[PDB]
Symmetry: C2
Subunit: 262 residues, 2 copies
């Protein structure tokens, strides 16, 4: 019989941060990927990836491969920041449900309505640490969210547009709480009238997702496409043949091209 030297996978140009939120003492596990390529003079673009445990490596590996030949692929070297949890799985059910939801569900269920506190954590706590530890281009920040994550990202677009210059919004759970998030869609044009930078919004959905999801995303897409404003660039992609769990890897490269600066 034969042996093998057994080891753990350690990914190069990555690191992890353990952090607790100031207000609630909530524990986060942050995954960070830095490009092999030198920063441009203005700093690296940065991509904040919600549900970091589920999607971090996928973003990391695609950027690491595609950004080598940027003029062929249209993908810029970017720092990836997975915003995750100290868990063994892909998703943290209770924690994300709270973090991603702007209001307490209408009339026990898991706590909802923690999006304000989560946004505070990101803006006031996580971002200053990333910006001090890495050379960041602060005019080239992207927020990615899928699912309830996409709900949160849509919420930020409607209420805190200037926080990110690109939004990669995947199968957003807009149905959530009787479409309460859509009640703030009104705000967008008001926000755009004062936006600092042209804002890119890439919306995606799988064609085989449940009818209410597919229809909601197509309707939202038609409303966003109707906007004609210098500060908004919008793109929609319905992934044909793809379902709720497979739209993210399928749409990833189109998203990366849309948010990139080549």
């Amino acid at each position: 019989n034969t042996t093998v030297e057994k080891q753990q996978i350690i990914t190069s140009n990555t690191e992890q941060w353990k952090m607790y939120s100031k207000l609630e003492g909530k524990e986060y596990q942050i995954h960070i990927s830095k490009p092999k390529q030198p920063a441009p003079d203005s700093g690296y673009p940065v991509i904040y990836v919600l549900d970091g445990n589920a999607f971090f490596q996928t973003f990391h590996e695609a950027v690491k491969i595609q950004s080598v030949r940027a003029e062929k692929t249209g993908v810029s070297p970017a720092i990836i920041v997975g915003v995750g949890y100290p868990i063994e799985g892909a998703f943290s059910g209770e924690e994300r449900c709270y973090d991603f939801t702007p209001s307490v569900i209408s009339k026990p269920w898991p706590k909802t309505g923690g999006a304000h506190n989560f946004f505070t954590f990101i803006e006031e706590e996580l971002k200053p640490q990333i910006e001090k530890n890495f050379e960041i281009d602060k005019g080239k920040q992207t927020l990615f969210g899928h699912s309830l994550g996409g709900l949160f990202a849509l919420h930020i677009l409607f209420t805190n547009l200037n926080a990110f210059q690109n939004y990669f919004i995947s199968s957003p759970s807009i149905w959530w709480n009787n479409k309460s998030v859509l009640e703030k869609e009104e705000n967008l044009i008001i926000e755009l009238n004062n936006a600092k930078f042209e804002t890119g919004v890439f919306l995606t959905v799988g064609s085989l997702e449940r009818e209410h999801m597919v229809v909601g995303a197509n309707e939202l897409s038609e409303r966003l496409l109707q906007v004609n404003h210098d500060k908004l660039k919008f793109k929609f992609y319905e992934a044909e043949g793809e379902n709720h769990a497979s739209v993210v890897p399928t749409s990833l490269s189109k998203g990366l091209r849309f948010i990139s600066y080549v």
Copy 2:
């Protein structure tokens, strides 16, 4: 802030040296959280493991939870990689993936660089079949009738070669942008051999072939022409699917076509 290292649950890394050459390999292994079915886990062997292992791992981990909805079976992932920090080795993969030796009389490009070592495919297959797989099958419950080979690029050239010459080694082939043009299309000299193999085949064999629509013209045409020929083979042991990824390129076809590929090679 407390600085840490990312350590992924239900994964491990093995260091191996091939018996014959002492070639060092880095093997990455992902095991599903879900228990093995009675006959064992399906298994996916991923060439250029350093480049693609985590992508396969993450997609299976997410999609296989709701298999009746996603069509993705829980599978063990084996990244067949190298002791490197990058996505791709240079000379090591070129040697491993290529079945023939480029003529020593091959002219050099203006750059004056000697041709890389070629013709190691036979030895690589020996390493996989006789060394790596028994080791995986000893340490994990494997369904040996539910094995996939994935290769992209020069890796897809290798995977095509095995399909043509050693079909029974895997029951599914995920062949991404295969470098068919390599050495004056030498790999296609074995294409007719596929009927012989199909007529000996134990299991129905799945073949998923993909290319990005914005790849070099000769690659796009090569893959399309191969697809048309494979669609002409009308055999009970061959199940073939082709996918041209509209608007994708050589580097981006993999993630884009990944889920289509996983649904095709799965058992739900």
